[PDB]
Structure 1
Amino acid sequence: SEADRQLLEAAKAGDVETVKKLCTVQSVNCRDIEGRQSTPLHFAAGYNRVSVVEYLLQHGADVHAKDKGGLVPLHNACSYGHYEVAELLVKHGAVVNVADLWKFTPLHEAAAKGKYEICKLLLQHGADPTKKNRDGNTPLDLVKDGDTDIQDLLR
């Protein structure tokens, strides 16, 4: 659908006014069929569009939606290091220990990317730093050797 394509794009662009105009029952959780099946909320989260994330969360977006690889919008926020988005998604019920297809959790992502505040957020909401992904790696295992502050945080 043409409105769907424009909504997904407005979410990436952070054009909240266009998002407001294009949001319908069906479009608010539509999927990018030719891409990774991301929803508007995956894109807003991944592109750090805080106002769009806030609007979507208030108007019918599913915080738990998975893309083709099993990523929820919290994974996108953590992977690209967007703290405010990660906090909003967690405050709105994102499951902090959710695993994608590869068994990576948001904390695996935040640890690998070395995002202090995001790791702190997830740990405070019960993120399990003992969880192994399919490489047998815990989030602590994914912290870069150069990233001393994150290592210490996760012990």
Structure 2
Amino acid sequence: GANSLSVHQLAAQGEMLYLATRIEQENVINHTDEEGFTPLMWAAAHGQIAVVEFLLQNGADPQLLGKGRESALSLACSKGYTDIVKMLLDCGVDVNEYDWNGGTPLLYAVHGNHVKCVKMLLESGADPTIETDSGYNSMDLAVALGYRSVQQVIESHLLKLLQNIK
């Protein structure tokens, strides 16, 4: 109907049964809206854990990007949705995915002061030396913003990774 919710809205609102019906009726599990967003991106952005799980189980593509090169991972990282980040990482996504701003999942996790997400990303190979468009990396951001626990996590990771310093 004219006022029926889109697949993106069903996913964002946690309407599991209606979403399951819709994706059976039409091939819309990866359908992109006017901003390029998939149902997975809407679910991830709204912290809908059960819907993210359901979409991934049903084969939704977690690697797709919106018109601004937004990814489900970066959206979840920016909001600190640790369990959704874990599911997406378990899928196999690019942990260093760049958007049109030069942002990456780690940079968003650092910006939001989401230490569990920062830890998880680093464990999955996120590179804290990748820079924004203005040339600042994750370490630079953690320092600038005074997020000390985040800074510690990043610095300890780098100390272990670097083989020129013991």
Q: In structure 1, what is the Cα distance between the partners aligned to 2:145 and 2:126?
A: 21
Alignment-derived partner of residue 36 in structure 2: 37
Moved more, 99-108 or 23-32: 23-32
Q: Aligned partners of 2:30 and 2:140: how far apart in 1?
A: 34
Using the alignment, how far apart are the partners of 1:48 and 1:107 within structure 2? 18
Measured against aligned partners, the alpha-carbon deviations of 1:119-139 in whole angstroms (never above 9, x if no partner) come to 000000111101112110101
Q: Where does residue 146 of structure 1 map in the other structure?
A: 146
| Structure with the greater alpha carbon radius of gyration | 2
**Displacement, 1:5?**
4.9
Q: Distance in 2 between matches of 1:105 and 1:5?
A: 31
Residue aligning to 2:22: 22
CA distance in 2: counterparts of 1:80 and 1:141, whole angstroms: 20
SS of 2:132's equivalent in the other structure is coil
Match of 2:85 in 1: 86
**Aligned twin of 2:162:** none
SS, match of residue 137 in structure 1: coil
Aligned positions, number: 153
1:49 is aligned to 2:41: no
Q: Distance in 2 between matches of 1:50 and 1:138?
A: 29
Identical columns (%)? 31
Q: Which runs of 5+ in 1 are unaligned?
A: none
Contact 1:5–1:32, Cα closer than 8 Å, also in 2? no
Any unmatched runs of 5+ in structure 2?
Answer: 156-166
Change (3 A) 1:118 1:154: same
Provide the rounded CA distance (Å) in 2 between the counterparts of 1:60 and 1:151: 36
Shift in Å at residue 72 of structure 1? 1.0
Q: Which runs of 4+ in 1 moved over 6 A?
A: none
> What secondary structure is seen at the aligned counterpart in 1 of 2:29?
helix
Equivalent positions of 1:60-99 (< 5 A) are 60-99=59-98
Q: TM-score, normalised by structure 1?
A: 0.92
- Secondary structure of the 1:53 match is helix
Distance 2:70 2:150 in 1: 23
